[PDB]
DNA sequence: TAATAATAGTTTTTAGTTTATTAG
DNA sequence: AATAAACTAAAAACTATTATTATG
């Protein structure tokens, strides 16, 4: 999409609102540049010393400083935000900031398409304010549609802060309403957790095909990549040692004949295969006809069984598909809904022979529906081939006369289980709540990568980017369950022996430490 | 794992299986077994020895005993040697250079088999012998039975079915021994593995750990990697390949490799060392977080195939005891273990659910759901994907009832191993045909084409009757 | 002075390179 | 200008394998 965001900051440093505002704006801009979102942002500085306004409407706009117009951020912009912007001394007026912000927006709306509009104003409300131009500012707000994400230091605020709070909540309820009160947050805490960690999103595309239930009776369907082990968007670029570009960098082979220095070229190779004691020659041109021929992007379903026979253990593949119908095909949609309701009622799972396209591979798959009040479709997971069914005989454990847990150990384990429950127990309100929801936490590898990137970028001489402790906080459960299980841990360690281990991995070498 | 199963094929030549003739499908089954072995496992050994002929080709030079293939890894040349006698003209030429039925002694053939078994210079896990004859031939019988008993005591297994069909002719071999239809290439492109995954430590808390044996059970199969054989000599090249200096000329070095990502304004140039150290977060193992109910699962968040977890009483003793206790507790508890798991160094952690895997021994004591736990990957926030809203229309009770009647008419038991990959099967068949200088072997769909295309009339299709839209929904 | 130590090269996975359909 | 069949390095173990320091 596209977003239009304006920035405004609140002497001016009086903890200090200036430091929190600078921290949050630097964090926001670094998150934008790391996510590489396609949206430009504008920066306006009201209250900074000096009347350097872009447009001087009678010099009524005091201390208005448009540091940056609506432009795509970069590392240069982030360091400019870190360095150049310093607190002012004389109070400014909110009307000037709003008027200049929407003037910049209107100037920048000519030339660039925008799919979203936002406003990010930060003020301690200690600056003197006058409420005289409500009509024009509210008209501009409802025209430019800049969704105000305003933030406050925090109530026991001062009279100037009280008047600022009441005018801002009045203008929000006039414009937006309750959400206008909601979008106002504290400079710390709420805003601190709002943008401390980022996320990434790689959008997939529909799989417009036909569900072939039966010989004919096909049903138009569209499928999407639902759950996927995410990969990094950008791979590392191996650049030159000193040029730092791609001049002496290339991937190439020699294909020297195993001899005495004779070599071979690409046309000289044959794609043989190790047929046991020897290698039979073979070529891709031979593969062209000596290969299975698929039939387009078929969605052939072949079998139906009970949900009991299948196993969550036997869930294979590397992706998940929400099997939806096609676009606005009401007959197909209701037919699919009836079919999935029938399958759910009978617990009657389906077997699907899937192929992504003509060049794809046949894929046996299990089909069972998912039903919610917001989305209703079918879930598809790749079923195995009998080659995948690896078998390894294992000795029984419940009959281990040599290792039989004592009943004291059993009760200690019970106490441990009860203490380290990581989910809220379902009370009379059905409070089956995940105290440690893993699915809502992004992969820490990417946040660590971006932390290292900023560490090296903003300071090229900084050798080692440290691990974020907040990641450890995200990577560790609340200490309540740990403290509860501490005593059961003591019981277990007293009730369970062990012997020594090996493979003591060490650092590369023992330099000065 | 060291040691394999040794099977040797012994077939009588007594001009009684020459009359389809028992010799014919005996040779066919031997060829099919050899093909299945060469496509399945190469560490095994095969041997072909015949007796009763007019020639005495064997190490100790015993009468009527002919050896053709000794104990060795399966090879295409052995397949061609078998095939040259497969036909009826092959049968007669075989009888020519080998000799028709003649006098012999089962003691001698068992002695030759024992010598051949001793000839191998490897630890050989199991020793089995397959023998073929139409009727039992048998003095000679006493010594033969005594020698057979001695060999059975030495650790030799025997196998045989009379080639008349029923259960009529095994009289002279009732005690000698301790069905080939399934061996007629019914299994193809089998894969066999014996190793195990990397054993780790279960970091359940800050001080005590459990030596856990990791086991993959359903890992994805794939075709063997191709080799870059030469065009004429048909042998691979040394494949020398590494970046050197081209723009400036010369040779590049690993120390010269700088990595960067052009982001925004500038390219953040770094080296590899930062890249690997970025991937490092903790030590290998499973750092336990706690327990979470199995009911608290999204039921549709599979991303990587599950891996079995087993005790390994080799580094701590508490593995077996504590795992048995937990599995006993897994009866009462439906909560699942939450663990931060890293297979090895420099790996980002993944949250792991330990679904209780309790052993379910059947009448034959099949290790269904082996005793332990399976690793269940839990997706991150970024692993989730957005989904456009869709709450257009519901279904009607009439429609759901009609769909129920349509679907439950057709039900399947869903045998797990009932399907194999058509691509891999066709690839193996093509390699087999090329290795034997033949035509296209065959095409056999692994039920990929639904069988419902012909039995839809058999199940009484009714959705064709029930076209809910006047305009054909299936245009 | 007449043992067990670190020890190669196995396969086996596992993560990082390449050509078809959306955007103009 | 995205996803994915289809190659391409790379990192444990299950096997043989050798230097201890056994002693004048």
Author numbering:
A (entry chain C): 6 to 15, 19 to 22, 28 to 167, 195 to 299, 301 to 554
B (entry chain B): 32 to 50, 57 to 175, 181 to 207, 210 to 222, 238 to 534
Pull verbatim passages from the article behind this deposition:
Non-homologous end joining (NHEJ) is nearly ubiquitous as a DNA repair mechanism and is one of the two main mechanisms utilized to repair DNA double-strand breaks (DSBs) in humans. In NHEJ, DSBs are first recognized by the Ku70/80 heterodimer, which subsequently recruits the DNA-dependent protein kinase catalytic subunit (DNA-PKcs), a large protein kinase belonging to the phosphoinositide-3-kinase-related kinase (PIKK) family. The final step in NHEJ involves DNA ligase IV (LigIV), which acts to ligate the two broken ends and forms a constitutive complex with XRCC4 known as LX4. In this study, we present monomeric and dimeric NHEJ super-complex cryo-EM structures consisting of DNA-PK, XRCC4, LigIV, and XLF.
